Amino acid sequence: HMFVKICGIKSLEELEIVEKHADATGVVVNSNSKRRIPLEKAREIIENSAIPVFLVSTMVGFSEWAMAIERTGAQYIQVHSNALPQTIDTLKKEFGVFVMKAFRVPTISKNPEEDANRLLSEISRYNADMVLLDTHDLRVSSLVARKIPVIVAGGLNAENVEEVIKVVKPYGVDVSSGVEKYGIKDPKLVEEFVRRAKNV
């Protein structure tokens, strides 16, 4: 129905919270991010999780990816970088990882239909198992989502998730800050977000 991923957890405690209701989670490594964690903490979250844990990074290099996967035992990766199609393809073959690749959508778009078609050719260049679209304008997202399964992310929360889902009609949604309080995932926000998203 509606895949819900809660991204950017930093502790086994946060894992337990998201594991209750979410379909997937993610740990940020080797990125300029407030959510970044050491490889040992990533390893702990991955080994203890009952749901897919995406290893999320802005790493570009085939070999830094390989080493991160080996060091963490990740079976799911989320690539937010210009890592080449060839790198993504080789990581899949060598490691059997499921690959989600992130693509930026415009904040504003002059012609939505053409921006969607442009991102779609950009997407067909990589051989990713899932597309994540990073978000104002939801029109481009709507039209990409109609052509291919996508997870949509960017500024989602309980107050806007239901509307975003109605417009975009994605395969799933991804949230981080929207379900947080003081930089820690909030059990009541998590439960509410997932419930509302699952209802549309």
Q: Is 174 a catalytic residue?
A: no
Q: Is-catalytic flag, 134?
A: yes
Q: Among 7, 23, 137, 186, which one carries the catalytic annotation?
A: 7
For the chain, what is the HEC assignment?
CCEEEECCCCCHHHHHHHHCCCCEEEEECCCCCCCECCHHHHHHHHHHCCCCEEEEECCCCHHHHHHHHHHHCCCEEEECCCCCHHHHHHHHHHHCCEEEEEEECCCCCCCHHHHHHHHHHHHHHCCCCEEEEECCCCHHHHHHHHHCCEEEECCCCCCCHHHHHHHHCCCEEEECHHHEECCEECHHHHHHHHHHHHHC
Q: Check 129, 134, 137, 186 and give the catalytic one.
A: 134
Catalytic positions are: 7, 134
